[PDB]
């Protein structure tokens, strides 16, 4: 029986994987970070409040210059803010008011948004006509489009409900490579700072590290039990972090190929909506469903300095590229920038 | 104000943007989202288009203007993905309209349609994501039900029926009861109806139904329930 032989071989391959992982575990992170200086009580305060949305804010993303800020709301609108002076730069209406995520392209020219319409739209900001219009409508997914991120002027990565990610070439309008290998829906995505590799976690408790050019699954991380719905690399791109409905964030290592550390509160039984790292990667800032937003010490796994300023669930967050300020956006239609 | 020239112009442009936002909010803040559901190619889209005619994988959105309120029927569900992490956009919806085709009985792949449809129905009515939303139920196409009663007995596929061979009213009552029982131990108000092509009243009931739904939440917020 070929099927039985293949299943057996996969089984002893899994056993070899487990043996290797155990062998390399000569310590844990908390066994070596016990003798490091703690951060201490650091409190950040709301410096601006970006208001103008009407319904919940679903996702947001800082531009590369770290000033501009694109946020997509249930209102069927994207709003491109100026986080220094709170002035709205652009307001983009949508063809389909069902938007789940957004993306500000690194060149600052294009903004990507997608959602239940199964399509990633690429709005062009810097045009003669002074308005902002779709330049491409990337279709080719079958399931619902969770999170799309840019790589350059022409290559955008998307992750959808097909249980698949795609590497779309915007100028031509067709996917170059499709990354398959998940089982659940690919609920989150994240790019390496050097953009050689990306990563994605799915509604099967597993995360997978993808190669952009080779298109084959480099490695897979397990350890979560509920849906991984937030990912953001450690700033050097050799580590990795996820947040799931386990009331838990986890930090994995891309070279140790195993869990590295966990962050959790027992009294918390609610899920996590978005994570991110600071510029030094010392702080794992994570939103939560209890309307708060914690700032974990991403190395000692011990801090509860909470960015508590929202009247409903903190949906999305991030840090500026140069790290001056974090930003959050919650279901109360407000984006609060903290520093 | 220490703002330079272009900064003042930028503030003016942002005020214009906020003006357009307020104008669109003037209709956005009074809109209700009612998630429309169904399975078996029963024609949920056709039924919504029929309401659009009666009174003034894809998503089709149908506005209704009822009694100085804007309802907006959302028609989605052609996708086969793992909808749990995609129904998050509908975590708090006013109501969940579920259309069923009463002609499905003793009509199949290899399995009769209502067993699959009602499994889907109970799966939706029991999600923890939808606990605060009432469930409305629209049993469409009853004339063909009458036609099929001249042919098919209910016991021909579902043995637990009891009644006369051609008692159409008994058939409607049993099927509606069948769909009601799958409501779990939770005290969720499951609405019901039987519609027809000339049923110019059925649209009203959706409004009526939503009314009660909101009313319920209000009483559920004041601990009067």
């Amino acid at each position, epitope marked *: 029986s070929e099927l039985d032989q293949l299943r057996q071989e996969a089984e002893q391959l899994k056993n070899q994987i487990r043996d290797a992982r155990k062998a390399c575990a000569d310590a844990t992170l908390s066994q070596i970070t016990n003798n490091i200086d703690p951060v201490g009580r650091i409190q950040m305060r709301t410096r601006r409040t970006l208001r103008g949305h009407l319904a919940k804010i679903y996702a947001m993303h800082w531009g590369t210059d770290s000033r501009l800020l694109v946020s997509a709301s249930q209102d069927g609108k994207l709003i491109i803010w100026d986080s220094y002076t709170t002035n709205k730069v652009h307001a983009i209406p949508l063809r389909s008011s069902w938007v789940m995520t957004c993306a500000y392209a690194p060149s600052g020219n294009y903004v990507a948004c997608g959602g239940l319409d199964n399509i990633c739209s690429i709005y062009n900001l810097k045009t003669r*006509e002074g308005n902002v219009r779709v330049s491409r409508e990337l279709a080719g997914h079958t399931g619902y489009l969770s999170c799309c991120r840019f790589l350059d002027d022409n290559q955008i990565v998307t992750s959808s409900g097909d249980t698949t990610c795609a590497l779309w070439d915007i100028e031509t309008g067709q996917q170059t490579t499709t990354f398959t290998g998940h089982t659940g829906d690919v609920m989150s995505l994240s790019l390496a700072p050097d953009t050689r590799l990306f990563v994605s976690g799915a509604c099967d408790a597993s995360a997978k590290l993808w190669d952009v050019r080779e298109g084959m699954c480099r490695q897979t991380f397990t350890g979560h039990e509920s849906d991984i719905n937030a990912i953001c690399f450690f700033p050097n791109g050799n580590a990795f972090a996820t947040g799931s409905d386990d009331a838990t964030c986890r930090l994995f290592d891309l070279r140790a190929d195993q869990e590295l550390m966990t962050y959790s509160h027992d009294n918390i039984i609610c899920g996590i909506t978005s994570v991110s790292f600071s510029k030094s990667g010392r702080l794992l800032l994570a939103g939560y469903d209890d309307f708060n937003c914690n700032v974990w010490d991403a190395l000692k796994a011990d801090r509860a300095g909470v960015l508590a300023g929202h009247d409903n669930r903190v949906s999305c967050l991030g840090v500026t590229d140069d790290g001056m300020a974090v930003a959050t956006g919650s279901w109360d239609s407000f984006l609060k920038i903290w520093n | 104000c220490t703002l330079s020239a*272009e900064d003042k112009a930028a503030v003016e*442009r942002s005020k214009m943007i906020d003006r357009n936002l307020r104008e669109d909010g003037e209709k956005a803040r009074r809109e209700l989202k009612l998630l429309l559901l169904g399975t078996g190619e029963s024609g949920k889209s056709t039924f919504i288009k029929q309401m659009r005619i009666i009174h003034g994988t894809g998503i089709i959105e149908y506005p209704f203007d009822l009694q100085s309120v804007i309802f907006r029927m959302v028609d989605v569900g052609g996708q086969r993905s793992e909808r749990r992490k995609w129904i998050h956009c509908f975590e708090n919806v006013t109501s969940i309209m579920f259309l069923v085709a009463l002609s499905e009985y003793d009509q199949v792949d290899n399995e009769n349609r209502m067993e699959e449809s009602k499994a889907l129905f109970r799966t939706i009515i029991t999600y923890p994501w939808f606990q605060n939303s009432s469930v409305i139920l629209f049993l469409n196409k009853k004339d063909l039900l009458e036609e099929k009663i001249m042919y098919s007995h209910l016991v021909d596929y579902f043995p637990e029926y009891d009644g006369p061979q051609r008692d159409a009213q008994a058939a409607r009552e049993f099927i509606l009861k069948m769909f009601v029982d799958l409501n779990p131990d939770s005290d969720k108000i499951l609405y019901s109806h039987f519609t027809c092509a000339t049923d110019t009243e059925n649209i009203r009931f959706v409004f009526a139904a939503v009314k009660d739904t909101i009313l319920q939440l209000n009483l559920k917020e004041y601990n009067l329930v």
Partner: single-chain antibody
Amino acid sequence: DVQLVESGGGLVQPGGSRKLSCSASGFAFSSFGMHWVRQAPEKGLEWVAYISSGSGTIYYADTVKGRFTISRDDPKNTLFLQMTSLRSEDTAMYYCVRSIYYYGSSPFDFWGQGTTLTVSSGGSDIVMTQATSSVPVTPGESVSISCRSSKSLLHSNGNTYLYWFLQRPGQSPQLLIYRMSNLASGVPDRFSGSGSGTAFTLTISRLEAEDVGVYYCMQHLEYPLTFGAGTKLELK
């Protein structure tokens, strides 16, 4: 490409009244503010009027305040400038000028083709100075032009509101460099900006015969926008 066409260039006896029309075709006119700029026969561009988006605010130069009128027709996408009591000191070409202001914008980017208005029978603002009036140029050489200001335009937030415009013989001015270092769309990378404070520098390397023209400094700190006399580059 975008398009603006003006009209109403009648020839009138002094003190009369006129109307000038700037029909816009090829962009969302309702989102752009507009200016009106003026050019005397042998002088430099001078600023005349400004009407913001949606007619929220309006500004006029001191030489014209209370004497000119300006208006926008959004549904018809047209700009009007109505003249009453025109002096003989207004016989000039008029350029309707586009302008959009937001973070990273490019004001004054596109200009109308201009219309002639021949009629025959201040202080506590910024003034720009042109160290020269013309520069001798063999093509292919690297040269530069220097502007000076009475007030340092480098505002508190780090912006420097200085623009540089080129006017080829027989065409409207086109925007070369906005905010003293940022070049506009379609501008070859030959041009660049330099300086600071009160001394501003336009440096051009590998000059092309197509780049011969007249260069102008706009300050844009104060709504009494003051152009420089500008220098005419000539071919040798």
